[PDB]
Structure 1
Amino acid sequence: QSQGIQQLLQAEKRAAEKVSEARKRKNRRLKQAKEEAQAEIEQYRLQREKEFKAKE
């Protein structure tokens, strides 16, 4: 077995973990896109609300 094989298997474990971090970062940041969109769409809603109140 010569032990270096076990170190390479640990480098596979770390390799999988590294790409898994990027998958986890993606899965978390997907909801930031919705939270940022929810902030923007309210501005248009408020603008049209104020414009409608001005017409009234």
Structure 2
Amino acid sequence: SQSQGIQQLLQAEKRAAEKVSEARKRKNRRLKQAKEEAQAEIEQYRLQREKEFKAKE
């Protein structure tokens, strides 16, 4: 009987702590990736503007 309730409450704490903590860690990673990928796309746009300017020059 009571062991299923013990397992439910121990699993409740584990899931509610871990799933939220993994998503918080993902949020930080996605934000860092936004800066990195934005800069990489900015460098590609800069390289295009420079190649375009060389064709004028």
Shorter-normalised TM-score: what interval? 0.5 to 0.7
Unaligned runs of 5+ in 1: none
> For structure 1, which segment, 2-11 or 20-29, has the greater mean C-alpha deviation from structure 2 after superposition?
2-11
RMSD across aligned positions (CA): 2.5
Percent identity over the alignment is 100
Query: What secondary structure does 1:3 align onto?
Result: helix
Please state if 1:10 is matched with 2:8.
no
Q: TM-score, normalised by structure 1?
A: 0.68
Change in Cα spacing, 1:39 to 1:2, as seen in structure 2 (3 Å) is: closer
Q: TM-score, normalised by structure 2?
A: 0.67
Which 4+ runs in 1 deviate beyond 2 A? Answer: 1-7
Change in Cα spacing, 1:2 to 1:50, as seen in structure 2 (3 Å) is: closer
Give the paired residue count. Answer: 56
Give, in whole Å, the separation in 1 of the partners of 2:44 and 2:8: 54
Q: How far is 1:32 from its partner?
A: 0.9
Give, in whole Å, the separation in 1 of the partners of 2:15 and 2:53: 58
Unaligned runs of 5+ in 2: none
